[PDB]
Ligand binder design. Sequence first.
Ligand code: CL
Lengths: 207, 207
Amino acid sequence: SVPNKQSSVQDYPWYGYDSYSKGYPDYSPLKTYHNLKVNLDGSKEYQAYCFNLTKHFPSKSDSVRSQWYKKLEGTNENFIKLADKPRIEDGQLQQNILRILYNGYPNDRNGIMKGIDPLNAILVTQNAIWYYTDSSYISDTSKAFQQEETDLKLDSQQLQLMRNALKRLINPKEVESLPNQVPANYQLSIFQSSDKTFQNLLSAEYV
Amino acid sequence: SVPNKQSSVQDYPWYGYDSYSKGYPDYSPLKTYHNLKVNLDGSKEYQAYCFNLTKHFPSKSDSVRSQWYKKLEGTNENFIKLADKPRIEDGQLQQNILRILYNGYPNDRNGIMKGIDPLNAILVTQNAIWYYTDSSYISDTSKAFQQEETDLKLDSQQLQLMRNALKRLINPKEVESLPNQVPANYQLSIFQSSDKTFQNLLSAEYV
Ligand SMILES: [Cl-]
């Protein structure tokens, strides 16, 4: 069921939470999976991804604690204002993030995520997002998800697909060579956390 | 007061927690400070620093949830086994971390932390630790702590001392070219979290 929580914070009406919680299919509290969502007073849930690695993850949906968010335009200016270490040397941060969301979970318009289990696909997408929003270190994708392999007990098939999908998502030249490019109507939103101790969120949708 | 919590997990007797909680002097729940500690059944608290930026921070001391830890030798092999993205290029990972702990808060053996307020000194040390444990991006220290400046309301004096200390701590040349070198009896310990969803910890002491 979709949560219906009304904000107690002026200008922060969006409820941001982790849906990988009790009630989620195959949920385990020992697994490092996440499934971040944003919704407004029990409305349609939007797939969300976090940024600010040194801040707290949004609380699980069954927690007594709730985090409130303000929806902003997903511009470069708003990322510079809210991100700790954005990868802005390519100068198309916003565009890179939009391309990842368009090609990642669940949109997957060019089939980069094909064969990857939903929670593993979210994990790949999130890692590609962190590469841009927090300048997270990714040198060799062939060596990626080593901790996740032991923590989540990923089989060789899933692990190889995940490594290849991450490689493709963080390479702009690779994404730009694909048949389906990001249209003007597919737009980025930044969700600013009311509580500065919690991570900010980001989401994309067709307008 | 020093917490006294007994583990129920075989081989994980250490209690690891964030002491920056209700009751700590000048505590604010809106500040991004941390003061991580490890202790054994109410014994002396040891200053701890976290790693694994994508995992959960240890819970605050006043939480119903407790995280349990196994004390391991602070070797390069144990870092490769538990860290997501360690900065191993120079093969001196363990020595680099030891040098940071020896020179950082509270040890400060070469006075690098002089004039920096305790929570700010922990913050500088933690950021220097993350640079090695998680390959966190630090290009120009002159620009460091921009989000912390607004979130923690740091004055110009503290901010300048913090930026200079970070620069010195992450430069292997600098620290090795200091009058006091890390002695053989100052040893590194890795605290392995029983719950794989939580950050691992690290601490150093004189043996
Ligand atoms: Cl967290």
